[PDB]
Amino acid sequence: DENKLNVRMLSDVCMQSRLLKEALESKLPLALEITPFSELWLEENKPESRSIQMLVIDYSRISDDVLTDYSSFKHISCPDAKEVIINCPQDIEHKLLFKWNNLAGVFYIDDDMDTLIKGMSKILQDEMWLTRKLAQEYILHYRAGNSVVTSQMYAKLTKREQQIIKLLGSGASNIEIADKLFVSENTVKTHLHNVFKKINAKNRLQALIWAKNNIGI
Numbered sequence: 001d002e003n004k005l006n007v008r009m010l011s012d013v014c015m016q017s018r019l020l021k022e023a024l025e026s027k028l029p030l031a032l033e034i035t036p037f038s039e040l041w042l043e044e045n046k047p048e049s050r051s052i053q054m055l056v057i058d059y060s061r062i063s064d065d066v067l068t069d070y071s072s073f074k075h076i077s078c079p080d081a082k083e084v085i086i087n088c089p090q091d092i093e094h095k096l097l098f099k100w101n102n103l104a105g106v107f108y109i110d111d112d113m114d115t116l117i118k119g120m121s122k123i124l125q126d127e128m129w130l131t132r133k134l135a136q137e138y139i140l141h142y143r144a145g146n147s148v149v150t151s152q153m154y155a156k157l158t159k160r161e162q163q164i165i166k167l168l169g170s171g172a173s174n175i176e177i178a179d180k181l182f183v184s185e186n187t188v189k190t191h192l193h194n195v196f197k198k199i200n201a202k203n204r205l206q207a208l209i210w211a212k213n214n215i216g217i
Contacts, residue, residue, distance in 0.1 A: 008032070009033070068200040165207075
């Protein structure tokens, strides 16, 4: 419906998902549709994906091999959509959440629907639904200067690989990189082909975007 918020839940489709989907559409003003993480890449260049204004992320079905596909789907189609995490574990390392650039709310694994409906209603009112701890972590981290949290796949790359990837996440060219490290253009190109694993980039664009989101010096 044109009136309602375009929401997209990133999850499995199944008895429960659909059951929550309907529950969310009963109480809040939204048109929700469910898309599994595994299929994100198929929605990247769809027109109707450009209309997504909220993404609801089932933290329980998230995994490292989807992260890359997500970051690009998010940039290519709905960079400006709000993101809301649900089913988040209690003992989560909040910095791990900075990776969601429009995080607007977080719901924990053992919150109930009373909380979820309350929370989501606030977020639909352009509030944010965070705990005091999390709000503090953001503030301490941001206030202290830091913008991005360098991720874990990164630290696992070789020295070449690391240097080559940082510069990529600076939108440098093949040539421009080969010229700051003093190496064959064809060389950086070969390192990159490796680096796409495990960072899991289907291509240079994914990696580039992966980069700008997952590595800050």
